[model samples]
Target chain A: AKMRVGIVFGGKSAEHEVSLQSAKNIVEAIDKSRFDVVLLGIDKQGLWHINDAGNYLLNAQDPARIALRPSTVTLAQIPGREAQQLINAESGQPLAAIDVIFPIVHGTLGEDGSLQGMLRMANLPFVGSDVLGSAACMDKDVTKRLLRDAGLAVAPFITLTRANRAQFSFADVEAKLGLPLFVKPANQSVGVSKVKNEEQYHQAVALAFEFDHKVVVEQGIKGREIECAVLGNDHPQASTCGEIVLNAQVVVPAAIAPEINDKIRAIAVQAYQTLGCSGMARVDVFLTADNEVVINEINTLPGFTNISMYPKLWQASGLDYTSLITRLIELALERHAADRALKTSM
Target chain B: KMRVGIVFGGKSAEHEVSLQSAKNIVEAIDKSRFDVVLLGIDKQGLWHINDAGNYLLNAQDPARIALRPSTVTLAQIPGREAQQLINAESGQPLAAIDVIFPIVHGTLGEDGSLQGMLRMANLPFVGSDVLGSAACMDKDVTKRLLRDAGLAVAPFITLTRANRAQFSFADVEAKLGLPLFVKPANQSVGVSKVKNEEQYHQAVALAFEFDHKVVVEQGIKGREIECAVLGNDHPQASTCGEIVQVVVPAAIAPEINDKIRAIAVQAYQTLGCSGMARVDVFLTADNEVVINEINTLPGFTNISMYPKLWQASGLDYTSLITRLIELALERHAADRALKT
Candidate 1:
């Protein structure tokens, strides 16, 4: 009896295309003998579709083609609900008595709590963080607050809420987050519109508004972008650190440095548990020239390509990709069973 | 326009009774002035009903009707495709969700986390203090806090997951004495089975299997009754309490006294319950009343000589119902508008 696994991907974020690419790799790499794979794709507008080949990548690139926005629409007739082999557009394909879920989603709908909530309602074991952890980690404002409350060292940043924007001026933002400020949306991925200068500030503000109403501006740490991966919750373990060696021309580099790798790994483990994140997460940090490491965001569902930072960091820690995927599935089931025991009612 | 949110009945231990009460109230509620709405009823066995009014009602038991389970599940659609909202059950009608009128019955769905999640989703809701909601309401956990927090309470006992059966036997004998009680992990409304010396051992074992653990305590001396408390998070205690004088022909004597009334009031304020709640208590043989438990959503289905203590307290079922709606709206606006 193979455990049916729904590999969910694509979402209503700018990282939707990147997620499609990542989902493609994940579906291809997943072990078929032990699992029955269901490729569930979320379009840019948040519509869920089932692919014939169990693939997330599309032949077309137009964003409008993706109808049924995430919040407004939901999948119908998933694996368990119907006997039809053909996927139901109203309900998703009847999930085939799924054992666990591997949400290969990125950015907004994927990494955030929305997807986790749906999974929770479905009562299926899913990979990565739970609703609370995913929601907390996705919102930059909430993430910083929780970490700071846990006594972790995060960079000095000011949150601009929709209400905050009404009362505060650009000068107020500039005063708190001085010049050489890095501004980005609270819930975006891959540093979509990192504003480094005054001229770029307007573009950053405009670009950020396009994604979210709330923006987070932090004092730029003129240092290296260091990355690390962590596994588990209560007692989490960190992998060797890899410095995100940026091209400097790109807004942010996706590469990692070789030195101070162990320290980065240690910090990654601390950050993951502090935020109560489970499974795997890529913790980004800025190592200042003076050797002080400031905290960055924890990606609950980090990019999982063969050469991606998540698997690469694990590889450096002596764990292979196949083993990494296997561990996640085991962790998901353990967490589900453990938490269910604590419930007052199922 | 007034928000006529139709909070559906719960799928709890007391589901049938809740549906009858919810449907009757929905029919009489002024829909022209307020937008008539409906939230599907969730019955514990993975079934949810869209048209709550059309559902069956048990005149006696009130929790045994059948509902159409949602065939159009949410997780089936691939994440890459543009997903649309499908009918959760067999009906193909599109769901028009406005404000969430949560009639959360027990556990996972009702507790504060589920409601908080709804709030975070930017949905307007009807409920009480978030932290106080799930905290003070869960029986086995919160009672001791109210007791230890300088509130009036009866001497009781607790059992945890770490403690086993042999430990429960020894602990109960030493601490709580004989003729003890055992209850569901965090349940209310007295669905729990009562036990004496002969049945105590088996009851303890049965409870642990049903929930994470059980709560066993020395039975208190008091008159079995309840008082209805209604208002917002910052609420005002009603004029009087409704006595739940149980008419069981059991050997245990029922004591009715002033001491019971005093403690019941204290328990209501201690929990910070909003909307409405019925506080149950026991009057002791010593003419002393001790707080027993509180029911967040009591089964107030059968009107008239149907054991509704609220009617005896001068507030009829209809008036009490209206107050709950008003309180729900006020609580929702306050919590939703502010950002923490």
Candidate 2:
């Protein structure tokens, strides 16, 4: 029997639309013979719902007039009857019993382990890192400390929590951190609100505060963004290094270079193993102009579009898109088997 | 109204004994001033009771007993609400509950996480610090640090899952190096199976089969004694530590006497323990007293005995019990006040 796979996407983060696009690509590319796919979409309000049949396009931006439920539903009152159904928010409908969950929603609630905690309580085995791992990876401060403890190289940064900021002044911060600092929320993903100096700090802080309370201030690395893909558990294999060279017209200047590609690939594998991360991950790094390599962050579920960097790096390394999906399912099964043995109640 | 919380019991190794203890305590507690509530924790793992009365815990054995069904209980229901009426498995009504009287027996369920989860559920509970509860509950890890930091310790060894024994003898001989002891890495209340050299191999294997990991240590000598410490965050522990004296049965050796006192204080402080805890010690043959472990949620069922120990130290049982409830409320408020 094909595994019951629940693909969760479209979250409350700023990257909700991006998640929609990513989910659409996954629904199309996932092998139908080996897996029974259940496309569950989480709306901007964090309400979860199983997308209706034959409707793969999840466009919550301007729904063509709220038809049935506008593709948004909450999991709270899922009917305890059937496996799946499309009922109004008022109409009680039972949520499906999923075999494995693949949460594609990026950042904040999705990636930060809050959603993972809900999944854990539901007793459903989901993909990617476990709660502790997800929480450690999502929180930049925790991630950096863990990575540094594991002897991995990370960029120098000063974390300012709400409590920390309440006591210290901006002048005091500047005195210690100096000029040309990159300020962003410690919980946000990618290069969302990376500011260069004091002038850009306000806008960056405002954007980052939308997601989390703790903001990360760091010295920005003047370098290229090299990317690498990792696969498997325990001894995960790193893909052939892919230098993300952003073509000026289509992409930004943060492109991957050739020389530091090998280093990025090595760090990518180490990052995943350090956190006991299973399945696939896209490790982003900064190779400075002076050839110094600094570890950025590891995405448990990087972008999986046909043109996405995660698949691109893996494709360059020889594992195609279909194989990547298969590997993720296998890892999820392994994790579930392990949890079944652990004590749940007294 | 006096808050009467019905603490559940049994389904643990000490089920019958715990029931007996709970029964006696429930019978004696001032019923008129305190709205006495009864919550039954059957051996079958179902927590139920009827109306508000003296709680009767159901047993796994035959003869279905008459017990009041509990209305209020702790659970992870649809909404973010933590406490609710006790309902059947099919979501039917059972009873209403006020506070979760957790009488968890052992391991994962009782060891602070459930309490932490309860705190998350916003239910007031009686216990030690989350850090202390978790720390003291784990025998091997906590004992080492607690003993070393408090400067009172017996020689011991720890055997992890990584140290797989080819033969039971080989495993014990290798990790513990003989004349050692073995117990569950995170069990409390003294229910773990102890093993000597002859039973080392079988004991180690048996322990591993039961738990994912086990802690093996060298045995301590002299006396097996226990002391009851109570307080709420920044606790004021009672003097005249109750000496179990299972081994010595008389006066403890003078040499290890000071060490035993220090170890008890260290265990209390390190575990971030609030409410109450029973610190067990092993006074060695050579005038040395060493720590055994710290119990985060010590049994209050032995109230008269445990309370008497504190009473001898100045604090009476009623005051001790009242202080525990006050501390729970105080800590709950402080925790809820934190900005998440």
Candidate 3:
């Protein structure tokens, strides 16, 4: 008997194309002996489509054609049914029962806990964090606040709300945080701008506000972008520290002092646990020249393409892509069982 | 034609409470402008469609009639198709809803799970969005964010899986002082008054069983005052109301009362709460107000503090219900206009 693992991708976000590439890799690389792969695609309009594996594989080369379209096949949750059934969208005939979901969708509705919430209501086990963790991590301001309160050093930032509007002046910001500042929407992965002047600063703030009502302005830290992969629930383990080299255009295990590397992994796990991230997360941080490790952000559902840092770091630690996928599925099932064991009622 | 679906009786500890709230809303809602549909979710988490008016009338014994006489069941299929209420016996489409008024509280219902599901379905729903609902539902997260924003919340400490092992009862008592309150960090029961180390240990042990995280707060000595906030973007706050055992109109100095109302609205908006929220605060004997907690989905029966406060402010129960539905649609439109 094989477990049906539904690989969900192609969300209503700017990273929809990236998700398609990731989903194609997973659909092809997932171990066929233990798991039967099911393709669930969310189109640009946020519609769920079940794909024919054969058709998906044929179009995998062409990223634009890889998305599943309006078909009779769709995932449906019938009342009293313990498991969600893949049914004919028009006829309502059950097709296949999904055992667990591997959500590789990134940003917005997918990564921001919207899909996780839906899966939870359907009582299905899915990879990565639950609603609270996903939502908390998606919002930069909330994530920084929680991380800082947990005793982690984060970049000095100021939150802007529509109510407060313009209490702080550009000169005041320049005087406090210095020239180069980063402006970002509080809850969006997009609409982030790095500004150096007052004109760019105003434009950046306006651009961020278009995406979200809440925006955050933070002092830019001149440091290396370090990331670590954390895997587990209750007790999580971090992989070897990796740095994203924009100039060299590659990711490799960061070359730092042994103590600095150890501290980075420790802080990564601490921030992950502080945010209550379960299953897995790619904890990204900033390491200054002076050995100051400032917390940056956490991606609950980080990229999983063959070239993605989450899998790349795990691969460097001797866990290959296929094994990483298996580990994630195992963690999902483990979490689901533990959650069901807890008493929900008095 | 406007079709409003009242979703109630979820798989939560507060299932019975949801039923009562839904029944009251269905009874009071204006029949002229809207058509009401009752979508009853049983304790087992099964969605059953029931006749709106009759099923609610016979809702006295919830166990006797778990669902109305209908073979139709609603299945929330995520993505474009949104949700479908189908005839389970014959596989026929039954109902198409314009807006959802989710009355289910606690755990999966009020704590952003339902809101998340609703958002994925791309459906217009009453109450807060996923972020606001989730943040407010977790007491520890709520207090920390509020305190960081300069709002006065009761001093509290959180014990999570990572730090629970190193936690000491004596240290907590010394920090928060005696007569502290211990409860689950997430939404659940088990609120205990800890006067000494013995009681603190027992309370922490009991609270941890209910949730993975628990919060201990210093008890505040003050008059419990509540204010209701409504609308989106630019929200308005209702007149101040008091909660003792039941709802009561509170009288305070005009200047202090205005400041409290303003602060209540500020906290609600600060948390990104849209549609509606009940902001609870404590006015100490020293005249300083401290925020207790905010309920994204407060109890909304005819007698509930949310509706009562709005009623005290001049908007009646029926108007408040209509206004909430309108706000849900307004929010839905505004959110849809924004790019993902």
For each candidate, what is the lDDT? 0.58, 0.59, 0.82
Q: Each prediction's TM-score against the native? A: 0.61, 0.61, 0.92
Clashing pairs for model 3 are: A47-B80
**Quality of candidate 3 docking, DockQ:** 0.56
- Every candidate's chain B TM-score: 0.75, 0.77, 0.93
**Per-candidate alpha-carbon RMSD to the true structure:** 9.9, 8.0, 2.8
DockQ of 2: 0.10
Q: After superposition, how far is residue A95 of candidate 3 from its true place, in Å?
A: 3.6
Interface RMSD of each: 8.3, 7.8, 2.3
Q: Give the DockQ of candidate 1.
A: 0.12
| Order by lDDT, highest first | 3, 2, 1
What fraction of correct interface contacts does each candidate retain?
0.15, 0.02, 0.62
Here, model 3's chain A TM-score works out at: 0.94
Question: Tens digit of lDDT per residue, candidate 3, span A208-246?
Answer: 888887788999998998999999888899988888886
DockQ of each model vs. true complex: 0.12, 0.10, 0.56
- Per-residue error for B233 in candidate 3, Å, reads 2.4
Candidate 2, residue A207: how far the Cα is off, in Å: 18
Instruction: Provide the lDDT at A104 for model 2.
Output: 88
lDDT of 1 by residue, A1-346 (tens): 6777777777666666666666666666767777767666766655566543423444534544533222333444332221232234444334345577799877654666656655564466789987656766777765675566456778788766543466655577678777767777776653445555666876776666555546777877778777778887545788777665535322222344545566676777777865558888889888877767788888888887666778877776788777788788878988788766643433
Kindly report which residue stretches of model 1 are placed more than 4 angstroms away from their true locations once superposed. Answer: A52-95, A162-177, A189-213, A248-260, A343-346, B1-7, B10-30, B35-37, B45-47, B50-91, B95-99, B105-340
